[PDB]
Amino acid sequence: KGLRLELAVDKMVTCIAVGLPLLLISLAFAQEISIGTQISCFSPSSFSRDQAAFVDSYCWAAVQQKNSLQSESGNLPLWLHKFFPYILLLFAILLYLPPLFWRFAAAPHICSDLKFIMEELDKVYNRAIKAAKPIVEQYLKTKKNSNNLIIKYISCRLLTLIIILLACIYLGYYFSLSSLSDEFVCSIKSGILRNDSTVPDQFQCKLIAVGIFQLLSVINLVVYVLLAPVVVYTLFVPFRQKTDVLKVYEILPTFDVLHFKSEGYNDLSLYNLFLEENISEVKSYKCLKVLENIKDPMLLLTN
Amino acid sequence: KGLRLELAVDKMVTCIAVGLPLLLISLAFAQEISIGTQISCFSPSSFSRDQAAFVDSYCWAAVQQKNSLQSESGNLPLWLHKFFPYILLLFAILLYLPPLFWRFAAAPHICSDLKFIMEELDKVYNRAIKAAKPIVEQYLKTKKNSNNLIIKYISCRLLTLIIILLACIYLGYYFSLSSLSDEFVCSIKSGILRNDSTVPDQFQCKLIAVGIFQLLSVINLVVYVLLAPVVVYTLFVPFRQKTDVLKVYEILPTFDVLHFKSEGYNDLSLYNLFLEENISEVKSYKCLKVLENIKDPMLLLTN
Amino acid sequence: KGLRLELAVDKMVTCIAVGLPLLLISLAFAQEISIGTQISCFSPSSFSRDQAAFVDSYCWAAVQQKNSLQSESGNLPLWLHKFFPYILLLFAILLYLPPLFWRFAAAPHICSDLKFIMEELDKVYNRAIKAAKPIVEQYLKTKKNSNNLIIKYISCRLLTLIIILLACIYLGYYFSLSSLSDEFVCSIKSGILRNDSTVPDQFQCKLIAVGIFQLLSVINLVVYVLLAPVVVYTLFVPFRQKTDVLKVYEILPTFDVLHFKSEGYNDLSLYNLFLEENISEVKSYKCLKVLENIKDPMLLLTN
Amino acid sequence: KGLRLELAVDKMVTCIAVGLPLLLISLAFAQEISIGTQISCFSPSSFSRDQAAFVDSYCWAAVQQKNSLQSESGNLPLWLHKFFPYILLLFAILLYLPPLFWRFAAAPHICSDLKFIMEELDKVYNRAIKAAKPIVEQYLKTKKNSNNLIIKYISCRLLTLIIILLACIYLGYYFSLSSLSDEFVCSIKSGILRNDSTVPDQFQCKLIAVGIFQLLSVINLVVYVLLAPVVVYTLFVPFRQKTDVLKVYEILPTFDVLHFKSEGYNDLSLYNLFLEENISEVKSYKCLKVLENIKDPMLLLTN
Amino acid sequence: KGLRLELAVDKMVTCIAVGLPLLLISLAFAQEISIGTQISCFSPSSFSRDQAAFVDSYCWAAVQQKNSLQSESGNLPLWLHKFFPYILLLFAILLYLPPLFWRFAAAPHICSDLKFIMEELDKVYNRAIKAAKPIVEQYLKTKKNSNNLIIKYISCRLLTLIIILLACIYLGYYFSLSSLSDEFVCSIKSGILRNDSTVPDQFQCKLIAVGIFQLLSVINLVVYVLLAPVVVYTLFVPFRQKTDVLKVYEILPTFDVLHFKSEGYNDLSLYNLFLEENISEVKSYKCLKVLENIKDPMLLLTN
Amino acid sequence: KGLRLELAVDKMVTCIAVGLPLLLISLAFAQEISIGTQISCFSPSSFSRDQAAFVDSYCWAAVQQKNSLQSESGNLPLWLHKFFPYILLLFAILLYLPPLFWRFAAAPHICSDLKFIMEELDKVYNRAIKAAKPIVEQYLKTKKNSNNLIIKYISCRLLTLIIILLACIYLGYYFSLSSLSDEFVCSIKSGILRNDSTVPDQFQCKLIAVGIFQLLSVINLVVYVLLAPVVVYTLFVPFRQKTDVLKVYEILPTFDVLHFKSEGYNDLSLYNLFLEENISEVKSYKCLKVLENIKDPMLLLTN
């Protein structure tokens, strides 16, 4: 309660990387701008409105099977054209899952430790205030050896980076299509229709809503390309920490002087990273910052 | 209130195994990507738009009866094609039911015991704190003999595994269809229509939205195949427990030293499993962990 | 407040027996899988699209009257085909009503007695705790003679069983239809249409969405067949009670020793059944169970 | 707050009698089972799809005027067929209004008196409890003379019974229609259409959704026929009261012995009826019932 | 808070008079019972489906201008037929506005005075109770002279009565239409269409949904005719008050004996009317009524 | 809690600049005023309704590719016409992002400092009040040197101004189109359609909903042109501050006299700007303003 328990940078990255595919999916087939269907086949004028509908439905369904259609770029582009929103949704879910793993596996494990450290710091400040008028340091030393949680953090970040990279590769390949792959030549000649001569041998079909799909693909690719360096930088946990949140506390006599920094690539670095975001919410923090920047015992006893 | 009362692994497994069939059902016939109907039959040009609609409706309804249609893979694939979402929903409900059974039959039976054990541990810690300046052990010994709740747990997990396995078998069989089973040859020649010559003997019909169905089936099959080892590992209740949540408490003098572990395949193992998730929410737990890892009476009396 | 006041078995039975017909009704004509209409009649090609619509509407409306249509299985199957969802909804309401009767007629009558008995047990435990360092028994004896509430309970269960049995009979009869009863021969020859020769004498009509109806009927029948033994067992109120919730309390000296069991087929059995579910929510219950299973005065005075 | 202030029988009667017409109205034209329109007229094949639509609309609108149509059962059945849902809604509102009158005119007038009597009884019980270790009777005597509220109660019940009876009469008359009154012979020959010869003199029209209307009418009639004896019995206010809620209180010495019963057909009977439902929610009630059934001063001083 | 601040009769009148036009508007064009459009014109068979649609739209739009159509009852009935729901909504808003004026202009002005008088009465009762063991009268005398609020009340009631009367006149005139005014003779001969001979000179049009409009008009007229005497009686503010709410308080010695009645046609009458509804919610009121009806000092000191 | 933490001018600017593109997008294709589709192509009368639909869909999809269409203003205007709502939404998101950055990166960093300064001022006022009967100044001096937050503020304002300017440029260029660019000449001659002679070589297509798009573009351009000077003025942070919120506090003896102003272009100016909005919510502020404007020790001790 009241703890962010999640970095701002990696709550923005998750929000963008999950919302954007959802937004693109919702915009791709929104009736505000969209057209009727996704396939349209040119059937002869003698055909009725139920034979033309059959041709459309058959050639939309037979886009999986390459034994009927005769395209120029192969059946893979048509496969991609039919199932673009499904792939976008799959990518969105694959991005959203690691945040759920991190939440369900480290919400209390970080919440309890954060609350305990905050209470220890508050007690130390209260003792110093009531004394002038090191449990936490030993806990930090203990956390230095335990190299468990930072491994999980960097593993989740690495797998999210891998998913982003593979989505970038897929979208860059999809956008590179000829833009004439949206049209093909179908044929309704299966079963009893193979022998009669009242149907033309081949129908010219066009996959509508492909230019929109390519536009959305390029938008997603450029956004993910911009976003990837953010995760790459986030991977460097020790470099993120600015080792200055504890040097202010070293002015206090009760607190253990010469506090350890975040270097070492351990869970101590992760706990420092989680601290720098939440220490600003501690009342004693600013009451000590004012004294440390303006300095001493008189000002300490003033508040 | 405040107790998870359900393991994270088996709240993730239930969530995935129930949500995924619902998601696939919602995506199968979502107008965002879907087509008009699920069947389309080719009727002669002389037919009006109400005779073609009658042919479509008749050949969609007569997909149950094999005395009219003349298919190549039998009527079973057509049966499956018509009722795929219903089978998916049935599987989803069959997965969701055992969680409801476990909830309705063990929510208070686990909640009361957990609260009592937490209060006993808190009282023991308070007595130790107020003394320096074994009811729970006997209850654990009692729970060791009672082999009732772990049997229910493993029974529910086993039946969920069986349901997952049978769903995997069904989806693997459904996906293995020829992909040409979506088309068949129907005939409207029942009753007074049998004698007239103004109707063709047979109509070529195609079941639309079958490739989408097979794609969803393969997605569900691969996800359930990935998920099955998780439940298989979950079946091994004694191996899951890391017998270290009580060895920390053995430092306390008031608490009964040499606490029993979770081995034995009894309700004690299940209670240990439920404890390891909830002990992290106990205030005394971390206040004892700090002392045990840094060690003693002086630090015990400090807090 | 906080009292279940309804058995888990008979809150599951009601939930299943009411939700399942609603689920089947919602699935029967859900546009996710359904087709356009429920009747389709084959009209000559010379007919316009408003004469064919008139034929469809007339032959759908005249399925009540048997003087026009010429079917083979009689007009009763057609009656059933037209009004299947209405019958399902009627069955659902008939199942849901007895729970409403039991609630509106016994919610306070059971709530007040349960709260009074819980308070009496708490007071007895408190007196025993504050004394070492029988109003409830006489109330139980009084409830033994009063044979009123168990009669209402078994009457409601019996009538719900009767409704389930009659629904099973109806659904088993409906599913046993020939599956060719969905088609019939109609005729629009009433009034001024009787004399003209521009209309064919008879039209071939088919009732769509009948195979789906039969599938739903068989699903409902099999579920209700599975569910009926549950209600049959529930009818045996005295056998359900495990007479062990009071033998634990007999260890207490203040409480009246040799507590009466639930046998006798009276309201005492029903009150025992309601107690076994709610006693687990009493704080004194487990505090006495630990002592009784591990045993005595020293442990009693410990807590 | 916490007072039912409305009898269970007459909160069930109102709920049924208001909900059922709403349910029937919602089911009559629910697209889950319904058909396209409510009228269908057979126009010649030479007519376009806008002349046939004009014929349908004209013959649906001219069902009010009997100078055009030539029916066999008169224009009254057609009037009823067109406006069945409106009449059902009017009946529902006429049933729902008297509950609103009773609420808006007697919610505080009964709430204040009930709360005052409950407080008086609680004070009497407290005085008896604190004394061993008649304001309410005089108020009851006063209420005996005041014959005002029971008159309003029986008037509301009588008018609801009259409304139910007239609705039963109307629905029984509507269901008794020939079932061939849903078809008639219309004619579009008003104005400039009277002289041309390109239109047939008469059109055969059928009112669809009449068999459904008759089914709903018979359902409503049978339910209201079942419900009427309930209101008839409810009319007998003095017979409803079981004069036993005050004889238990006569054991108390402070309370006025020989309490008056509910007989007399006054507001005292109504207040007794409202008491028997709410006295079960009084804490002192059961604490006195236990003593009275098991009996005395020792048990009175025990609690 | 807790004060009705609005008479039950004039909260029922407003509710009915505002809800009923809304209900009629919602029912007039509810697709549950309604038909496709509100106008239908008979165009020759040679016309396409876009020329017939143009004829319908033109003759629906040109119902304002009388230079084209040739009706028999004038263009005023057609004007009324096109804009019936708008007039109903205007009437509903005109009825709803005066309640908003009364609320926004007299909610605190009545709330503060009511709360002050209630507190004064409570203080007088408390003083009498604590004394045996006239500010409010002077305030009433002051309110007697101030003839301001009753003028506003009767003005609002009078204007609502005038609005109801004019709505009754309008609806009675609208219902009295010939019922053949729903049909007329239109002509599309404006501009370049005046010279060509491929269009008929005149088209026979019918305004659908006019019989429904007349039915709703007669329903509204009869309800408002029933409702008008209620407002007429409400206009007589002094006659409404039953001068008995203060004669009970005159038994108290501290309270000023011989309290003034409500006669005089001043704001005192309105304050009496507002008091009789809210005095029943005062605890001291019934505690004094019991004593006054059963009588004295002994009973006064008893409570 | 209770702190605005965002200037009114820059919460109005963000609200307008984000809501207006959303409002225009919602109005552009709202069915309340809109037409059926966005493209319409004129196909020969011999074409069926499925060949004309194919022509429409093909020429709407092939508006990306310039090898088929033959327009007069180039393919860029057609590109803009197809994707106008997408560009509007992109602009809206680009405007909305910097507010999210400022919130997520400076909500606690400003909230904690504001609360600390408010508490310091309250303590100073309380000490002065309890004394007659400089931590904050030193903190202000410290904030004077720290030039960090104002840089972020002006950077966000500058980038929002740049986005507004580029959106203005784009909308001014889009509105300047010829207004005949909404029509073009398409051709369905790709694949097997290239050789047959049953199709015309070129089709005349028109992009509907372009005049509406240009109207919305001019509205957005004029609003953003009006709004840009507001952001330009907002860029001048030091000029915004009226250095009078601290000169009132200098009357107090305890507070450090001769308080520094906001000039200097540092974080002190930003903190002054945030103070002037929130100081009005401080109770001591007005209690000191009254004394300072009416002046002294007697009035200071009066409150």
Author numbering:
A (entry chain F), B (entry chain D), C (entry chain E), D (entry chain A), E (entry chain B), F (entry chain G): 26 to 158, 194 to 355, 362 to 369
Which lines from the publication concern this structure?
In order to observe if a dual substitution of both the residues (W74, R75) by charged amino acids could compensate for this behavior, we created a PANX1 double mutant (PANX1WR/RD) by substituting W74 and R75 with arginine and aspartate, respectively. Incidentally, these substitutions are similar to the pore residues of PANX2 revealed by multiple sequence alignment and structural comparison with PANX2. Surprisingly, we obtained a minor fraction of well-assembled PANX1WR/RD particles that allowed reconstruction of the PANX1WR/RD structure to a resolution of 3.2 Å. Whilst the global structure resembles the PANX1WT, the pore diameter was reduced to 9.3 Å compared to 12.1 Å in PANX1WT. The presence of R74 side chain facing the pore renders the pore of PANX1WR/RD highly cationic as compared to PANX1WT and the pore diameter resembles PANX2. The main interactions at the pore in PANX1WT are W74-R75 cation-pi interaction within the subunit and R75-D81 interaction between two subunits. As these residues were mutated, the interactions are lost in the PANX1WR/RD. Instead, in PANX1WR/RD, D75 of one protomer interacts with R74 of another protomer to stabilize the structure. We analyzed the differences of ATP-γS interactions with PANX1WR/RD and PANX1WT via MST binding. This revealed a reduced Kd value of 67 μM in PANX1WR/RD compared to ATP-γS binding affinity for PANX1WT (18 µM), suggesting that ATP interactions are moderately affected by these pore substitutions. The data revealed a two-fold reduction in current density in PANX1WR/RD compared to PANX1WT but retained an active channel despite the constriction of the pore radius.
